[PDB]
Design a protein around this ligand. Structure first.
Ligand SMILES: [Zn+2]
Ligand SMILES: [Zn+2]
Lengths: 173, 183
């Protein structure tokens, strides 16, 4: 495989020339965030700000909730590896040139989500799930949840889902 | 006028309710921000753009937050228009953010204030980037043609940028656009 087979032809052309415009190349690879996971990650980022837990840097939480689904855009056993190498490629062939801190921190936050070596990654995955719960509920509000209270880690988002389920039982009747 | 006018009823029902689900209501308010002048997508591309700041003297966390909130007063939208957005941010904070995270309320209010009215370096950077990506938009559009172009959005860009770093980005971009038109 090759982690450029999905990078468009002309962005590849932009980066290959010596000392390219890595910023426009980024704002182009991102101006592709609409296929719409851009809204998804943005909404999750805004949601992270509501964590009561004192043991939280919600800034890293936003970082995680802004970069994690942003990997599966290009790209399982082969996946969460080759996704790792495409994140590697974006970090070291786009971000590392014109940004020192960002390449490192971005990769390690992507891992912090894709291995959950941090409480923030756990919160962000909890949110990727609980927002979808909200969406299923607000959908059937015009007319499936699957044990998802078990499928939540943290106690805080567990309580969020508990409130959501109370509202479910209110609605149906 | 008052901000409650520009708010869907379903959410107000979620709110004048005993044990209101403030998180669900916040998620609803966020889920109807998908709309452009999408603005959720605009703020997301902003959020990932601001991470490309290398002015070591900048809190890019506050940058990402200002970016992700600076245009959030937009479900509730002629000097009084900014009055309405200010009262809107305040209404959303005192009545939706305070009742579930008292600190996030004063974080969001002051991040929005740091943007629209400038207060920090992070605000300057986020504003410069809202202009920069619009410039990228216009250039890609102009590229999909032989030119014209659509000068008028470019006349005088390097003067609407306040930071050195984004001035540099914009200089590179204007160079490449002149290269396009030299063909
Ligand atoms: Zn997701
Ligand atoms: Zn903006």
């Amino acid at each position: 495989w090759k982690p450029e087979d999905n990078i468009p032809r002309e962005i590849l052309a932009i980066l290959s020339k010596p000392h390219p415009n890595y910023q426009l190349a980024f704002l182009n690879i991102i101006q592709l965030l609409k296929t719409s996971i851009s809204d998804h990650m943005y909404r999750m980022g805004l949601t992270t700000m509501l964590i009561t837990d004192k043991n939280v840097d919600r800034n890293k939480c936003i970082r995680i909730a802004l970069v994690h689904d942003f990997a599966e855009s290009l790209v399982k056993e082969e996946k969460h590896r080759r996704e790792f190498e495409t994140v590697k490629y974006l970090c070291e062939s786009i971000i590392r040139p014109c940004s020192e801190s960002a390449s490192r921190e971005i990769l390690d936050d992507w891992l912090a989500y894709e291995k959950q070596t941090c409480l923030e990654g756990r919160y962000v995955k909890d949110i990727d799930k609980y927002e979808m719960l909200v969406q299923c509920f607000e959908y059937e509000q015009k007319y499936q949840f699957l044990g998802a209270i078990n499928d939540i880690k943290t106690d805080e988002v567990k309580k969020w889902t508990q409130s959501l389920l109370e509202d479910r039982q209110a609605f149906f009747d």
